[PDB]
């Protein structure tokens, strides 16, 4: 049955080589193992436990009831428990290797190359459509999810993973900053749609901005999402410059960005200045924003109670 299950599992068997009172057992400890063969060995060893538990089901039916610690899924099994079950399957893989049979079917791609950060980014990608629906009905269920679970989840994960995830991942660096871009774009020019239920969106934006792995990678790359960062920076500069039509002239939809956008800008400027990332931080898709932001700060270099925030932003920049 051990071989019949493998045959029925749609796997080809091909002969590649020739099979090489006191018994004389040949040495079989000189053969190594491969990662792909580990899955085959585990699946084959699962068959013995499956065919044993199938009969144990009738045995316990005859008994009338009872719980046994040995009747557990194979994924629960540990090497200590596997020491009594892996031998019967390991003794045949070396046999197959020395007989001459052939079975055909980097490890980062197979493993969690995307990881928790990219899983959260996919969740935010679905939340993009969710937020579109929420804005359409604003102009039911995912709103509570976003305001309850995932926002604290990222707010804590980025805090606990600020180090060792910014200096050794590369693919995640190019997408954490992009996630920061859609997070900044998620909140519109007003914050009434989010309401007072979730003021933590500003703190989560702070935390994400303070953890930008691709400080120089996002500028030295082929600039796929650098357009998004440029758009976000240009929108921030335009929103700041639009305040001269209210503060310097006399209100609505613009005062909400003085408590949810300016602190994020200060945090981003402090993040850039702290590590001396100015070597390569104003590159393709960034000078087009810096050349406008210098004119913007020149324009509002002459502007009540918002003076300390403007001074802090100027100091950070």
């Amino acid at each position: 049955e051990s071989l019949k299950a493998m045959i029925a599992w749609e796997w080809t068997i091909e002969k590649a080589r020739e099979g090489e009172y006191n018994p004389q057992p040949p040495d079989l400890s000189g053969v190594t193992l491969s990662r792909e063969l580990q899955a085959m060995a585990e699946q084959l060893a699962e068959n013995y436990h499956n065919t044993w538990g199938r009969k144990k089901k009738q045995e316990l039916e005859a008994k009338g009831g009872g719980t046994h610690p040995l009747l557990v899924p194979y994924d629960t099994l540990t090497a200590k428990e596997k020491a009594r079950d892996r031998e019967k399957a390991q003794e045949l893989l070396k046999f197959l290797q020395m007989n001459g049979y052939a079975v055909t079917r980097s490890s980062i791609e197979k493993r969690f190359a995307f990881g928790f950060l990219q899983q959260l980014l996919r969740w935010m990608d679905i939340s993009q459509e969710f937020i579109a629906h929420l804005e359409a009905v604003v102009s039911e269920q995912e709103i509570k999810f976003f305001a309850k679970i995932l926002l604290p989840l990222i707010n804590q994960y980025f805090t606990n993973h600020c180090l060792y995830f910014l200096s050794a991942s590369n693919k995640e660096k190019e997408m954490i900053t992009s996630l920061f871009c859609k997070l900044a774009a998620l909140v519109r020019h007003r914050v009434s749609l989010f309401g007072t239920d979730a003021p933590a969106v500003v703190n989560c934006l702070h935390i994400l901005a303070r953890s930008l792995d691709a400080r120089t990678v996002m500028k030295s790359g082929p600039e796929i999402v650098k357009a998004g960062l440029r758009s976000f920076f240009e929108s921030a500069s335009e929103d700041i410059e639009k305040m001269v039509e209210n503060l310097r002239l006399g209100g609505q939809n613009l005062t909400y960005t003085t408590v949810a956008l300016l602190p994020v800008l200060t945090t981003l400027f402090q993040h850039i200045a702290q590590h001396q990332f100015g070597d390569d931080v104003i590159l393709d898709d960034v000078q087009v924003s810096c050349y406008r932001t210098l004119c913007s700060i020149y324009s509002l270099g002459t502007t009540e109670k918002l003076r300390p925030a403007l001074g802090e932003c100027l100091a950070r920049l």
Partner: peptide, 28 residues
């Protein structure tokens, strides 16, 4: 719990190329 879900193994007929493997493994 762990309700058994056995895989179909009594339907497939073994080929002639594997009888030698069966006998050799039994002797081993």
């Amino acid at each position: 719990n762990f309700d058994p879900r056995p895989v179909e193994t009594l339907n497939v007929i073994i080929p002639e190329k594997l009888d030698s493997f069966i006998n050799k493994f039994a002797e081993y």
